[PDB]
Design a protein around this ligand. Structure first.
Ligand code: F6C
Ligand code: F6C
Ligand code: CLA
Ligand code: CLA
Ligand code: CLA
Ligand code: CLA
Ligand code: CLA
Ligand code: CLA
Ligand SMILES: CC1=C(/C=C/C(C)=C/C=C/C(C)=C/C=C/C=C(C)/C=C/C=C(C)/C=C/C2=C(C)CCCC2(C)C)C(C)(C)CCC1
Ligand SMILES: CC1=C(/C=C/C(C)=C/C=C/C(C)=C/C=C/C=C(C)/C=C/C=C(C)/C=C/C2=C(C)CCCC2(C)C)C(C)(C)CCC1
Ligand SMILES: CC1=C(C/C=C(\C)CCC[C@H](C)CCC[C@H](C)CCCC(C)C)C(=O)c2ccccc2C1=O
Ligand SMILES: [Ca+2]
Ligand SMILES: [Ca+2]
Lengths: 75, 739, 31, 172, 80, 42, 122
């Protein structure tokens, strides 16, 4: 059978927004070289490269989470 | 000198055979090793604990593998009440055909042993169904043992050896072992029960291949986060539920029904799941009590050293000086070991007392031999653990206690009124022994003279009242839970006694062991048990408190925990060390546990026979125990082999004798002492030296066993014979008359 | 239906890893 | 700026000599490897050369019988297969002992060439005398013949020994 | 070998020396007691540990103490 | 038949070989190893 | 040579007990095999004991009767090499004697005909 995929709803937006936000908090304070390049609070003042990296990885991780949950009936 | 032992030059220079013996007896006494520091001591102990955990995991893996390989687990699933579980196969190449036929049973086509450890019922309850699952569990436990062995090796490497401060940090260890080791483990076990065990008990297979997308409850996890917890308690298993099937099966994962499942006669799986959930929550809460790295949390040293109760000047908790104790426990490994052993002994006693009355495993209450074996096993282990707790208490008194850092605290007060403590323990022991033995032999004389009505038969009215207060209406009392109108039974403010119906149904069921009916014989045997407990405690406490010295030997602390004596002077000082007190107390522990297991076994044998009147009328005099318990039930055991053939009890028949042999040998090590054997050995040395063609010659001079070594060897033989004889008798008398 | 020959042989092979690790731990503790 | 980092090297030079064409590895220098290899009968300290050969011959002659019994050309019958395995072990062991004899004859002339000379320091070849080789060879032959016969007798009596190890001899 | 220690409560009664079956002890000049002598154990290598000296000692508590230690051929009293 | 030790489990020859090995073949070499270990001069 | 003679005698006589009163005594072939195996096992155990005795005894100056200054006339093998040669002789002689007894017992019918002259019929 084809794994189940759900229509768009506020929960998938919550997962993607949260995954991007958690990655933003971790990456700006854990990666080897943040604050490299042009500059953009509670964050470590990440650079434009670090922020775009965290948003791109937030989409990557977020898509994996929502597809994984929807596959298993919310795990 | 020899390389062996590596940890003692004094032993390595010993030119006699003693060097070998003591090398085995002091190998794990790390603190006495040459050039031992505290940090090295703790690191070696850490690695040894890793090794012991690996050994435990390998043992569990071996049990699982042998059941999956040579057992009959799948056949036993289809009929737990009539199929004999198989422990493992028998390969004894010196068997005869009658023995091979006798031991080929339980549906097997080869000689097998019958499992009595209860692992079949346990694995059945927790949802295991196939031999492949047991094999996977065995492989996983092999891998886990490998992991722990590697961890033990790794934490000995220079970079990974923990510092002494890491071992001494008590508060983080307590936090992690309460919240994580106890709490998180309990939560994970409840998760296993909810996700796997309960669906399997409801005829639904849940494994690694489908547990991710098979919710345990229809309400899902949404009901938990929205506060709709009651949805988990809706639609429980019906009283007509058939285990391992969907017939009469509900959907609830956390009920609080109480009592027993009507068919399996064991605790409800959902009840145990909710139990472990609540226990996990409580232990995770308890694991946040002490401060580690964030300011919040109690400091145990501050609590023990505190002297102000909200401003008022108090000498300590309950107005008792507890100051200086934090360093006492934190620096004494023997004090911690004493608490750990005492706690484990109490836990084993509670395990034994609570599994027979409230069986947790499906149909295990109807496997009589398994019940007896488990109860006797855990009670004897508890007795050994208690003996060890007090032995290491004495070791703490000698090695780790100094009066200066404990000046004026509660431990010093106990040491100061040790005389009153010991004298009052002796008085309690004397009173109990005198009156219990006197009443027993009075009943003996009255029954022997044909006057059984003249016996003193004191009713156990207090325990009967407790049973009635727990809901037992047999005695006619109308108090608390046996009174439906009592405020305890109604719980007037809230009426949340959702446990009471099932609990009362289990209590008043006559076919289980929940609060068995008790009469005068039970009274007398409980007082015998109290006598045994008090005498064993007297021996152990007198040894621990006198370990530092007495009037006979004021300077005993300078001689260590285990030494033979102080010579024949001052009247004679045989068996004067605290080690000798532990040695003597092992005898009393064995005797007390023998009384306890005799009582349990005879009562349950009478119940299972359908002849409760035999126990009720014969347990009030000691001839009843001697005749109707030992002599009456030894017949099938001693007829396992005879001039007319052999049956499956033959092994027990042999072991029953084997124990009697070992016990007898112990007397030789306990009655005869060293000098006799030393002189005999000298004569044998002359004989060997003067005999031609005997080219052999000792590299270690043959000497008689030391005094302490002789006591230890005699005690070991005594205990081994005790255990083997009673185990053979128990198994033969229960299995020979039942499944 | 108990386990097969292959499963027994695989268990025997797997048990070698804890055996070697136990030997390593024992020799390290002997130091 | 040059850091060979030899002091933290897991693999050290063999016996502290970096120019002896060897490494200190787990196979060559670990405590278990040294204990096992140095206590084999070839290297065990104190053993007489004859006793070395006796143990080596026993072990080798015993297992050399096996291959022809199971996959040999007489494997169709039990009696023939056992005989062929015994003869194969005897032929191999006698040929090896002949080689050991002519090795001793040719090696030990004057000062032997190579690793068996007076000034050689080969720790893996300690039999530096002609007498030791002939004592070793006598032990090798007698041990190999005895071990081959021991395997031959067990295989020839396999029906009885199988009943022995199953308790079938306890019927009567 | 065993360890034999003499404490300052010794009264120089010489009984421990007389009771010793292997001549471990001797009497040496001293000033701490009226007898002007005290027990000494120069030859603890020969001490078998019989504790006859402690039995002979009249003081309370003992002025001479034997602590059993590493066992040698002569400490086990072996003629072989 | 019940005149001999047999095994219906997988690889029933394994007890057939392993019981002798553990109980009356290897134990004497193991005792020899231990005896050599405990008699070595320092 | 000492070991050879001692082994010959002992291996020869060690076969009989299991042949006559052993658990395979009901049949001649099995009884002879069991006796031979018992002799082999006992002799191999004794030889292993002799080997480990030689290993442990002769380190430095041996303790007891095998020391340099010992004058024990009943224990004259004061060298490790002597003990190893003795052990080799013991093993070989014991195996030879056990096999000789096994061959004599296995051919007991033929040997009994031999000693009664029954081989002279044809
Ligand atoms: C080593 C070596 C040696 C030698 C040689 O060389 C010897 C010799 C003798 C003579 C002289 C005499 C006679 C003999 C008989 O009969 O008896 C015995 C038996 C047997 C069997 C013994 C045994 C023998 C040998 C040991 C053999 C060995 C072999 C094996 C098999 C090995 C094995 C190995 C493995 C590894 C296990 C004797 C005797 C006596 N023993 Mg005496 N030994 C010795 C050892 C030992 C030890 C360890 C001990 C401890 C246990 C003892 C003990 C004893 C006693 C109690 C007595 C008595 O009484 C006796 C007498 O004195 O009279 C009088 N002793 N020696
Ligand atoms: C228990 C216990 C017991 C038992 C059981 O019961 C027995 C038995 C038995 C039986 C199997 C027989 C028989 C069998 C009939 O009858 O038939 C056959 C015969 C024939 C074949 C015979 C034929 C003839 C021949 C060959 C001759 C001989 C030769 C020589 C060895 C040489 C000599 C040289 C010089 C002079 C020495 C016998 C004989 C014996 N022996 Mg008896 N054992 C016992 C003991 C002993 C002791 C201690 C001692 C000591 C040491 C002993 C010695 C001896 C000797 C020398 C002898 C021989 O001549 C043999 C024979 O091996 O053989 C082959 N045991 N082994
Ligand atoms: C943490 C939440 C979460 C959960 C529950 C899942 C769950 C799942 N993922 Mg997934 N994933 C996640 C996060 C998660 N993912 C993240 C953060 C990423 C990184 C972007 C991925 C990247 C990912 C890939 C690339 C794939 C999955 C696949 C799967 C499915 C494997 C099915 C299975 O049993 O294979 C078990 C497999 C073995 C035991 C081997 C399963 C439904 C696979 C899939 O589509 O399955 C249908 C797949 O190919 N995941
Ligand atoms: C959540 C984290 C956690 C967990 C799960 C554990 C778990 C464990 N620790 Mg541990 N430890 C931790 C954190 C943790 N530790 C921290 C933070 C420290 C440093 C302060 C230590 C320091 C430490 C030491 C010094 C030792 C352990 C040991 C152990 C083991 C005890 C043996 C056993 O299995 O008990 C049985 C487990 C049960 C759940 C049974 C409990 C049942 C009872 C009777 C009912 C109540 C156990 C595996 C011991 C060891 O070496 O083991 C290898 C040991 O000596 N711990
Ligand atoms: C008489 C008291 C008694 C009884 C009835 C039991 C009963 C049990 N024990 Mg047990 N045990 C006891 C005391 C007892 N224990 C004590 C005091 C110790 C501490 C040493 C142990 C240590 C112990 C271990 C380590 C294990 C058990 C296991 C078991 C179970 C399977 C074995 C069996 O059928 O019974 C035992 C039947 C007997 C007749 C006991 C005597 C057995 C021998 C003959 C005793 C002598 C030992 C040996 C021969 C001498 C040294 C060598 C069973 C529930 C096993 C288990 O958990 O199963 C999975 C297991 O692995 N027990
Ligand atoms: C987790 C539990 C635990 C731990 C860590 C320890 C640890 C220790 N104990 Mg202790 N003890 C315990 C439980 C424990 N005990 C219990 C339950 C008892 C009551 C029986 C005792 C009674 C006890 C005494 C009386 C003494 C110790 C001593 C010691 C110390 C030295 C050990 C020794 O002598 O070398 C290792 C010792 C042995 C290996 C003994 C040989 C085995 C005995 C004879 C049992 C017979 C074996 C039996 C037939 C089969 C068992 C299974 C087999 C595999 C061995 C060590 C710190 C000694 C000490 O501190 O000296 C001052 C000491 O005198 N303990
Ligand atoms: C059948 C065996 C047996 C019996 C009856 C006793 C009895 C006793 N032991 Mg004991 N013990 C035994 C075996 C036994 N032991 C063994 C094998 C060991 C291992 C070495 C020990 C180790 C041991 C220790 C280490 C301790 C005891 C203690 C005690 C006493 C505590 C119980 C008590 O006061 O009851 C009341 C007394 C009795 C029941 C004894 C019998 C009284 C008789 C029947 C009175 C009869 C009077 C009558 C006129 C006599 C006739 C005349 C006659 C003199 C000719 C008690 C005297 C403890 C103790 O002394 O504490 C006070 C203690 O510390 N025992
Ligand atoms: C501690 C676990 C344990 C125990 C007590 C036993 C017990 C037994 N096994 Mg066994 N076994 C186990 C685990 C265990 N098994 C595991 C994990 C495997 C898979 C590798 C096997 C595979 C196996 C086979 C193939 C056979 C047995 C057999 C037997 C029986 C005869 C002994 C024998 O030949 O051993 C043989 C042992 C092995 C082949 C390997 C054992 C591996 C374990 C893990 C070693 C455990 C070491 C231990 C923990 C350390 C002890 C420390 C010391 C202080 C006590 C006996 C009932 C024989 C049998 O059934 O006879 C009827 C038989 O032929 N076992
Ligand atoms: C390294 C190792 C190993 C291996 C091992 C091996 C390789 C083994 C082999 C073994 C073998 C391979 C053995 C053998 C042995 C032999 C023997 C034991 C023999 C004996 C013999 C005899 C006894 C003989 C006798 C005789 C004679 C001399 C003469 C007359 C005749 C007769 C026959 C009697 C393993 C993997 C396991 C593990 C890891 C490590
Ligand atoms: C003192 C005396 C005596 C005794 C004696 C005895 C004890 C004897 C014994 C004897 C014996 C007991 C003998 C034996 C012998 C032996 C022999 C003679 C052997 C031989 C062998 C052989 C010849 C072998 C060979 C072989 C080999 C080497 C290899 C290959 C195979 C074969 C088999 C060929 C009497 C009483 C009479 C009298 C008085 C005095
Ligand atoms: C019999 C006896 C002897 C003689 C016993 C001796 C010298 C020991 C003999 C043991 C022999 C040599 C081996 C026995 C081995 C055991 C069967 C198993 C040991 C297992 C461990 C080695 C693992 C004493 O020396 C003695 C001393 C003090 C009080 C009582 C006695 C006492 O009763
Ligand atoms: Ca027979
Ligand atoms: Ca003829």
């Amino acid at each position: 059978t084809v794994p189940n995929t759900i229509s768009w709803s506020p929960q998938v937006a919550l997962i993607i927004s949260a995954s991007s936000l958690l990655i933003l908090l971790i990456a700006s304070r854990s990666i080897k070289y943040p604050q490299v390049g042009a500059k953009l609070p509670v964050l470590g003042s990440p650079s434009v490269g670090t922020f775009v990296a965290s948003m791109a990885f937030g989409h990557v991780v977020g898509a994996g989470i929502v597809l994984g949950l929807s596959n298993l009936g919310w795990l | 000198a020899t390389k062996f032992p590596k940890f003692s030059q004094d032993l390595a220079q010993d030119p006699t055979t003693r060097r070998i013996w003591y090398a085995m007896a002091t190998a794990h006494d790390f603190e006495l090793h040459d050039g031992m520091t505290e940090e090295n001591l703790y690191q070696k102990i850490f690695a040894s604990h890793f090794g012991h955990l690996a050994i435990i995991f390998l043992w569990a893996s071996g049990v699982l593998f042998h059941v999956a390989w040579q057992g009959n687990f799948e056949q036993w699933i289809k009929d737990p009440l009539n199929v004999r579980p198989i422990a493992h196969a028998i390969w004894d190449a010196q068997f005869g055909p009658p023995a091979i036929e006798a031991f080929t049973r339980a549906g097997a086509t080869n000689p097998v042993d019958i499992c009595y450890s209860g692992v079949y019922h346990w694995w059945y309850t927790i949802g295991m169904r196939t031999n492949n699952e047991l094999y996977v569990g065995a492989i996983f436990l092999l891998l886990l043992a490998a992991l722990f062995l590697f961890a033990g090796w790794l934490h000995l490497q220079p970079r990974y050896r923990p510092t002494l401060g890491w071992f001494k940090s008590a508060e983080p260890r307590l936090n992690h072992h309460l919240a994580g080791l106890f709490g998180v483990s309990s939560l994970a076990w409840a998760a296993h029960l909810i996700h796997v065990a309960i669906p399997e008990s409801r005829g639904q297979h849940v494994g690694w291949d489908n547990f991710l997308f098979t919710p345990p409850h229809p309400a899902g996890l949404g009901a938990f986060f929205t506060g709709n917890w009651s949805a988990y308690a809706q639609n429980p298993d019906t009283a007509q539920h058939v285990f391992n099937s969907s017939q009469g099966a509900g959907t609830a994962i956390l009920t609080f029904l109480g009592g027993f499942h009507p068919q399996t006669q064991s605790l409800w799986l959902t009840d145990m799941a909710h139990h472990h959930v609540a226990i996990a929550v409580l232990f995770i809460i308890a694991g946040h009590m002490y401060r580690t790295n964030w300011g919040i949390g109690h400091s145990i040293k501050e609590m023990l050293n505190s002297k102000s109760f909200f401003g008022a000047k108090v000498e300590g908790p309950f107005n008792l000086p507890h100051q200086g104790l934090y360093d006492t426990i934190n620096n004494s490994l023997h004090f911690q070991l004493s608490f750990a052993l005492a706690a484990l002994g109490v836990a084993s006693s509670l395990t034994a007392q609570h599994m027979y009355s409230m069986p947790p495993y499906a149909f295990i209450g109807q496997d009589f031999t398994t019940q007896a074996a488990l109860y006797t096993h855990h009670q004897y282990i508890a007795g050994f653990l208690m003996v060890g707790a007090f032995s290491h208490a004495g070791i703490f008194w000698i090695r780790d206690y100094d009066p200066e850092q404990n000046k004026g605290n509660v431990l010093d007060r106990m040491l100061r009124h040790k005389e009153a403590i010991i004298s009052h323990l002796s008085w309690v022991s004397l009173f109990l022994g005198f009156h219990t033995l006197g009443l027993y032999v009075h009943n003996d004389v009255e029954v022997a003279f044909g006057a059984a009505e003249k016996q003193v038969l004191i009713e156990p009215v207090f325990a009967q009242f407790i049973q009635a207060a727990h809901g037992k209406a047999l005695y006619g009392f109308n108090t608390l839970l046996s009174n439906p109108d009592s405020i305890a039974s109604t719980a007037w403010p809230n009426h949340a006694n959702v446990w009471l119906p099932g609990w009362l149904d289990a209590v008043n069921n006559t076919t289980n062991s929940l609060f068995l009916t008790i009469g005068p014989g039970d009274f007398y045997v409980h007082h015998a048990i109290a006598l045994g407990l008090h005498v064993t405690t007297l021996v152990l406490v007198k040894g621990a408190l006198d370990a530092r010295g007495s009037k006979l030997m004021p300077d005993k602390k300078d001689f260590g925990y285990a030494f033979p004596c102080d010579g024949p002077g001052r009247g004679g000082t045989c068996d004067i060390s605290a080690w000798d007190a532990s040695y003597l107390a092992v005898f009393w522990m064995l005797n007390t546990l023998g009384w306890v297991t005799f009582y349990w076994h005879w009562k349950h044998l009478a119940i299972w026979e359908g002849n409760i009147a035999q126990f009720n009328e014969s347990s009030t005099y000691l001839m009843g125990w001697f005749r109707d318990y030992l002599w009456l039930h030894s017949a099938q055991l001693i007829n396992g082999y005879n001039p007319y053939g052999t049956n499956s009890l033959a092994i027990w028949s042999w072991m029953f004798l084997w124990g009697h042999l070992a016990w007898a040998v112990s007397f030789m090590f306990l009655i005869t002492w060293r000098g006799y054997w030393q002189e005999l050995i000298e004569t044998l040395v002359w004989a060997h030296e003067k005999t031609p063609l005997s080219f052999g010659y000792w590299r270690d001079k043959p000497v008689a066993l030391s005094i302490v070594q002789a006591r230890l060897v005699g005690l070991t033989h005594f205990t081994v014979g005790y255990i083997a004889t009673y185990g053979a008798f128990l198994i033969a008398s229960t299995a020979g008359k039942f499944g | 239906m108990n386990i097969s020959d292959t499963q027994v042989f695989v268990a025997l092979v797997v048990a070698l890893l804890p055996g070697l690790l136990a030997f390593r731990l024992a020799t390290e503790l002997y130091k | 700026k040059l850091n060979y980092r030899l002091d933290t090297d897991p693999v050290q030079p063999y016996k502290g000599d970096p120019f002896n064409s060897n490494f200190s590895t787990a196979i060559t220098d670990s405590p278990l490897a040294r204990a096992f290899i140095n206590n084999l009968p070839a290297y065990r300290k104190g053993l007489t050369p004859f006793m070395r050969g006796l143990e080596i011959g026993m072990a080798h002659g015993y297992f050399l019988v096996g291959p022809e019994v199971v996959v040999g050309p007489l494997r169709e019958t039990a009696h023939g297969a056992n005989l062929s395995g015994l003869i194969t072990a005897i032929y191999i062991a006698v040929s090896a002992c002949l080689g050991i004899s002519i090795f001793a004859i040719t090696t030990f002339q004057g000062d032997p060439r190579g690793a068996y000379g007076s000034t050689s320091k080969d720790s893996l070849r300690p039999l530096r005398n002609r007498d030791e080789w002939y004592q070793l060879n006598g032990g090798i032959f007698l041990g190999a013949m005895g071990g081959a016969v021991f395997a031959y007798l067990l295989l020839e009596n396999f029906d009885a020994l199988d009943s022995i190890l199953r308790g079938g001899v306890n019927v009567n | 070998s065993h360890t034999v220690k003499i404490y300052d409560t010794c009264i120089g009664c010489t009984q421990c020396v007389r009771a010793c079956p292997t001549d471990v002890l001797e009497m040496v000049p001293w000033d701490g007691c009226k007898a002007a002598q005290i027990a000494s154990s120069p030859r603890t290598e020969d001490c078998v540990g019989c504790k006859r000296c402690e039995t002979a000692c009249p003081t309370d508590f003992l002025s001479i103490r034997v602590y059993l230690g590493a066992e040698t051929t002569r400490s086990m009293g072996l003629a072989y | 038949d019940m005149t001999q030790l047999t095994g219906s489990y997988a690889a029933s020859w394994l007890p057939w070989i392993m019981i002798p090995l553990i109980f009356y073949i290897l134990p004497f070499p193991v005792f020899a190893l231990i005896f050599i270990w405990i008699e070595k001069e320092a």
